[PDB]
Amino acid sequence: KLPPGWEKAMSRSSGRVYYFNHITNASQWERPSGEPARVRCSHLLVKHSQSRRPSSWRQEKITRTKEEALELINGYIQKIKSGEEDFESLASQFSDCSSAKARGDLGAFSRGQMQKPFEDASFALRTGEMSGPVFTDSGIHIILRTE
Ligand SMILES: OCc1ccc2nccn2c1
Ligand SMILES: OCc1ccc2nccn2c1
């Protein structure tokens, strides 16, 4: 029935069914639709004090907690989903990855190159789809599959 990683769940505040993906952490009301050697993705990274390197082009010393980083990620996802801001604009302004300068674009990659939670989420996304918060040793990511 449902494509890889997708499950049905129950809204606590409304009672309506929704869909959640335990590989990408995406969630949506709509029933999802449904592997290539390579995918292309953009991402927005928010680092935290336990990141493998807690420093970035934005801040010499990253001191925010992982919980604070998750709140920031959740807020960016809200703004992207409402259309108030674009993914590319938020990545350019706020991603702690040097790829911020390229609107978050990482280029194309195969399995075996990225950190595993990032790789698994990227390959479970369909072209055009966006992840929820994805956790790695670098921090917390929002991933957009572009090809
Ligand atoms: O896959 C269909 C789909 C997924 C996500 C979504 N968000 C708003 C409308 N949406 C439709
Ligand atoms: O962080 C790795 C990476 C990937 C792509 C890229 N484009 C501009 C800077 N960039 C950095």
Ligand SMILES: OCc1ccc2nccn2c1
């Ligand atoms: O190989 C990873 C990497 C690092 C730095 C960088 N700058 C532009 C593209 N880039 C890719």
